C-alpha cells in the first residue's frame, strides 16, 4: 500500500500534537481562557474540559502523530501526574522549535541531541531551584499543602479542593512512608449535597431495604464471601431446564423462587448474622432473607472490604467456602442511613485508621471526576513530596529558569546545537507566554525579565497570572514537587523527538 515521506510525516507530526497542544493551552500556565469541549460528532453535549486526557480521547486521537502525545501525555499524568496537560502542550511547544530548524534544514540528529542534551541541563537546572519545603514534617505537611496547592489548581471545583488538600496531605501523614491512594477509597455519588468531599466511616452502600427484614444490624462481624446467586444459585441444584408448553414459560419463572430459599438456610449453618454475599437481592428476597435470622447483605464492595481487610485485620479474597477461609470482617454498626428519599445501608463503626473511604457528593458526577485526578495527582505528587521535599516553583518559574542556563549554555555549551538547546530554552517559555497574555500581562516582559528575575535568583518570584502579574511562588503557595516537573518534561521530551526523527509512515 502506502509509503509516506518525511515532510508530511514531520508536518502531520507538527500539526496534530500542536493542534492538541493548544487545546488546553489557555487553560495552562495559570488560568487564561478555559477550554470548552464541544461534542458534536458522537453526541450532542456542552462540555468544559481543561484536562488533556479527557480532551485527548474525546476528540479523535486517530492522528498517528496525535496518538504519540495523546499516549505520552496520558502516560505522564498517569505516572507523575498532571503531565498530560503539560506533555500535550510541551512537545507541541517543541514541535514548533525544530520546525524552524527543520525548515532551516538542521540535521534531525542535531535537534534530537541538543534538546535531549538541554532536556538534561534544564532538569539539571530544574534540580537547583527545586527547594525542600518538607524538611520539617509540619513544614512538610506545609510542603504537602503548597505542592497539592498547585495540583488542585486550574480545574473546575467549587469547594472540593479544600477536602483534598488536607487529605492528600493526610493520606501521607498517617501512612508513614507513602501516601494513601488505595487506602483512600473513592465514592463518587449524588447526595443531598451539590458540593461535598468528606470522610466515609467504613464505606456507605446504596439500597432500598424494605419489607419484613430488619433494616439495621448491631455488633456486626461480617462473613466475607464472594460466592452467591442472583436468580439462580451456584450449587449442584442451580440449573433446571423445563418448558414443554406456553404455561411452562410462566411456570419456569416460579421455580426461580425455589433457588433463592435454599441458600437462605445455608447462611444459617455458619449461623453468622452478618454475611456479605456481594451479589444483589430484591425486596421479595429481602422478604425471604428476613425470615431466617442469617441475613445476606447484597452488593458488598470489593475495595470496601479491602478497606475493611486493611484496618479490621481481616482478609479480601475471592469466592468463599467456610468462615475461616476468608477472615471475618468486623464492623461495630452496619446501619441504613437515608440520603434524600433513598436510604443507604452504611457500613460503619469503622472509621479511617489504616485506610479511608471518601464519599464525594457533588451536584453532578462531572464535578466528582475532576476532583479525583486533582486528588489522584495531588496524592501522587505528595508521595513525590514524601521522598523529595523539593518543590520547584510553579507558574513555569522553573521553565524560564530551566531556559536561563540552557540559553546561556547553548551559546557556550554547544558550538553547534545551540539551535536545539536555545530552541529548547525557547519553547520552555511558551507556557508562560500563552498564560501571561491570557493574564493580561505582556509575556515578553514575563518569560525573560521575570526569568532573569527568578533565573538570576528570585525564584519565589514567579507567575501570578490570575492577577496578570509576576507573583511569589512560595508566598502564593503555587509550587509543586520538583518530581512533578522533571518527568512531565521527560515524557514530553521524547513525545516530540519521536515524530521529529520519524521520516516515513507506512500504511496497510
Amino acid at each position: 500500500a502506502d509509503e509516506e515521506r518525511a515532510e508530511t510525516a514531520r508536518l502531520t507530526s507538527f500539526i496534530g500534537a500542536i493542534a492538541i497542544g493548544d487545546l488546553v493551552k489557555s487553560t495552562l500556565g495559570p488560568k487564561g481562557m478555559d477550554k470548552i469541549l464541544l461534542s458534536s460528532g458522537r453526541d450532542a453535549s456542552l462540555m468544559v474540559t481543561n484536562d488533556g486526557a479527557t480532551i485527548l480521547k474525546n476528540i479523535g486521537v486517530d492522528n498517528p502523530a496525535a496518538k504519540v502525545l495523546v499516549d505520552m501525555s496520558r502516560v505522564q499524568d498517569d505516572e507523575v501526574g498532571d503531565g498530560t496537560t503539560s506533555v500535550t502542550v510541551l512537545a507541541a511547544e517543541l514541535l514548533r522549535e525544530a520546525e524552524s530548524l527543520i525548515a532551516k534544514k538542521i540535521h534531525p540528529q542535531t535537534i534530537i541531541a541538543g534538546w535531549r542534551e538541554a532536556t538534561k541541563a534544564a532538569r539539571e537546572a530544574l534540580l537547583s531551584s527545586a527547594v525542600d519545603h518538607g524538611s520539617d514534617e509540619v513544614k512538610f505537611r506545609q510542603d504537602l499543602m503548597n505542592i497539592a496547592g498547585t495540583t488542585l489548581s486550574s480545574k473546575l471545583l467549587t469547594h472540593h479542593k479544600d477536602h483534598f488538600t488536607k487529605l492528600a496531605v493526610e493520606a501521607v501523614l498517617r501512612l508513614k512512608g507513602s501516601g494513601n491512594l488505595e487506602a483512600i477509597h473513592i465514592i463518587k455519588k449524588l447526595g443531598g449535597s451539590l458540593a461535598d468531599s468528606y470522610l466515609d466511616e467504613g464505606f456507605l452502600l446504596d439500597k432500598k431495604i424494605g419489607v419484613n427484614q430488619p433494616k439495621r444490624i448491631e455488633n456486626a462481624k461480617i462473613l466475607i464471601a464472594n460466592t452467591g446467586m442472583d436468580t439462580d444459585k451456584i450449587k449442584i441444584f442451580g440449573s433446571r431446564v423445563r418448558v414443554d408448553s406456553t404455561a411452562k414459560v410462566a411456570e419456569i419463572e416460579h421455580a426461580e423462587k425455589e433457588k433463592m430459599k435454599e441458600k437462605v438456610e445455608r447462611i444459617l449453618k455458619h449461623g453468622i448474622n452478618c454475611f456479605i454475599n456481594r451479589q444483589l437481592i430484591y425486596n421479595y428476597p429481602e422478604q425471604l432473607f428476613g425470615a431466617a435470622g442469617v441475613m445476606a447483605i447484597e452488593h458488598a464492595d470489593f475495595a470496601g472490604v479491602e478497606r475493611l481487610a486493611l484496618v479490621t485485620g481481616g482478609e479480601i479474597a475471592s469466592t468463599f467456602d467456610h468462615p475461616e477461609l476468608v477472615k471475618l470482617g468486623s464492623c461495630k454498626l452496619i446501619e441504613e442511613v437515608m440520603i434524600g428519599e433513598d436510604k443507604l445501608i452504611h457500613f460503619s463503626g469503622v472509621a479511617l485508621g489504616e485506610a479511608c473511604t471518601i464519599v464525594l457528593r457533588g451536584a453532578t458526577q462531572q464535578i466528582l471526576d475532576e476532583a479525583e485526578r486533582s486528588l489522584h495527582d495531588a496524592l501522587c505528587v505528595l508521595a513525590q513530596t514524601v521522598k523529595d521535599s523539593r518543590t520547584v516553583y510553579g507558574g513555569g518559574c522553573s521553565e524560564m529558569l530551566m531556559a536561563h542556563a540552557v540559553t546561556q549554555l547553548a551559546n557556550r555549551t554547544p558550538g553547534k546545537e545551540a539551535v536545539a538547546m536555545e530552541s529548547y530554552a525557547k519553547a520552555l517559555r511558551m507556557l508562560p507566554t500563552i498564560i501571561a497574555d491570557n493574564a493580561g500581562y505582556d509575556s515578553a516582559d514575563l518569560v525573560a525579565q521575570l526569568r532573569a528575575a527568578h533565573s538570576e535568583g528570585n525564584t519565589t518570584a514567579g507567575l501570578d497570572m490570575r492577577e496578570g502579574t509576576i507573583g511569589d511562588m512560595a508566598i502564593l503557595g503555587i509550587t509543586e514537587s520538583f518530581q512533578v516537573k522533571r518527568q512531565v518534561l521527560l515524557s514530553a521530551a521524547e513525545a516530540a523527538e519521536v515524530i521529529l526523527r520519524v521520516d516515513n509512515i507506512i500504511k496497510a
Binding site: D2, S239, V241, K507, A508
Partner: protein, 517 residues
Amino acid sequence: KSRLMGLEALKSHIMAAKAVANTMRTSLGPNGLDKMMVDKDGDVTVTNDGATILSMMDVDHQIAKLMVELSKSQDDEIGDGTTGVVVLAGALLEEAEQLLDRGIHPIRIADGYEQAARVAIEHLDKISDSVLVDIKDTEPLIQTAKTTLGSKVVNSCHRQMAEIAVNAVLTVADMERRDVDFELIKVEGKVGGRLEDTKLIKGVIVDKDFSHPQMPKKVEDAKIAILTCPFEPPKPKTKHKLDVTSVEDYKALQKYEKEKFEEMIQQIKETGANLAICQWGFDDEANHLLLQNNLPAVRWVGGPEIELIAIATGGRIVPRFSELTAEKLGFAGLVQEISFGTTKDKMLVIEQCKNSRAVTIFIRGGNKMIIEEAKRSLHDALCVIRNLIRDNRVVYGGGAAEISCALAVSQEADKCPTLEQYAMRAFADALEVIPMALSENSGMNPIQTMTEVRARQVKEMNPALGIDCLHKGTNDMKQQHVIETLIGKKQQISLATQMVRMILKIDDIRKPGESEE
C-alpha cells in the same frame, strides 16, 4: 495488459527501489531515523529497521517486494546488512540511469557494476579475515554485539544479550559445521520483563507450570511422563460436542473422570515418571486428583511442544496413554517454574545439562516492541555473531570500506578497457551512499565527511579509522568498534548488484503499468 521495455521499463524499475531506499537510508545505522508506520488496522509501528520497514512495507512496485525478500536472506545469516543492500540498490540504480542516458546499454551497465563488485568483495577480503573459537570470538562478538544489539537500540548495559548468543549458535551448531541453526536456537521473549532481563536456556522453557505448587515444584532429573492423553477435553475429533444441562448426568459424569484421571495419574506414578507432561493437559478436576495423588505434573501442552520437549531434551517419546510403559522417561534436568525476579513471567524450564537440542535464548523487556526491539537485537546480534563465531571476519563499517572498495574498483575500472570501464567506475561511485546517508544520519555533510574516510583510505587504505557511525565525535571504525562481518558486505554487495542486475537484465515488463505486484 501492456508491454513495457527499455527506458520505459527502466524508469519503471527506478521509482520505488530508489524511493524505498530513502526512508531506509534515513533509517541507516543507529543515527538512522525512526519511522512511525501506521496500518489501516489502527496499528502504529516506529521503525528505523528497514527489514522491519520492508516487513511493514506492503507498498506496490514488485521490486519493492523483492527487497522485503532480499533483506531477510542477509537477515538470518549475516544479521545486519538488511537495510544497506536496499539503499545500495537505489544507489547503483540511479547510478545506472545516466549510463543509459549516456547510451551505455542495459546489459553493458549491470555487468560493469557486477564485476566491479567482485573487486569490492575481493577488496573486502583485505580488512580482517580472522577466525577464532567462541570464547575468543565473544570479545569481537560483544564488541559487535555492541553494534548489533546497539544499532538495534540498546546493546547498552548488556553482555547478557551479547554472550548468550556466543553460546546460542555455539551449542545448537558447531563452529566449523557453519550450518545455520537459528532454528535450533529458540529466541524467546516476554513482555513484562526487562531489557536487563535476558537469559540463555539450552533446553526448553514451557510457560505452563505445575498444576499446583502444593504439588512438588521440583521434579527430579528426567522422569518426565510423555503423555498425549486428555486430562481435559482433548478437542476430540469424533463427535458432536455438547455439555449436559441436567443434574442427573451432572452427577453421573463427575464420578467417571475421578476414577480414570487418578488411575491415569497413578499410572503415571506407575510409569515411574514423577512429572507428567500432557499434550492434552490438565483441567482442575484431574488436578485435584493430581494434587491428591501428590504427583508433580504438567497441564495443557502445545502439541508439537511435547515433541519439542522430546528432541530438545533428547526425550524419549511415550506417545499416548495407551502406549504406557515405565521404561521411556522424558528428559528434564530440573522441572520447575521459573520466576526471574519477574513473577508475572513464569515458565517451566526443562533444563538440559545432558541432551539439549533446542537452545532457548530468552530475553525480556517492558513491552511488545521493546522485547521485539530486544529480539531483533538478540536476533541479528547472534546472526552477525554467528558469522564471527564461525569465521570472525570483520570489516569496519561506515563507508571506511566503501572508499577502500571504491578506490581499487575505480582505477581497476579504468584498467579494464571494456565499456564497463565507466560502469565499473560508475560502480565505485554509488558505494559512497553508505557513509553518505550515515553521515546525514549522523548529521554530517557526507561529501566532505566521506572523503575524510577517503583521505583516510588515501592514507590508511583500510577501514580502521573512519567517520562517526555512532555520531560520537571520534571518527573511527575499528576504534569506534564499528565492526562488520567481512562475509556480510560480500553478502550485502552480491545481493544488491545481482538483484539489480536481473532488474537490469529484466527490461521487459508486461504489466498494466510501470510497476505491479
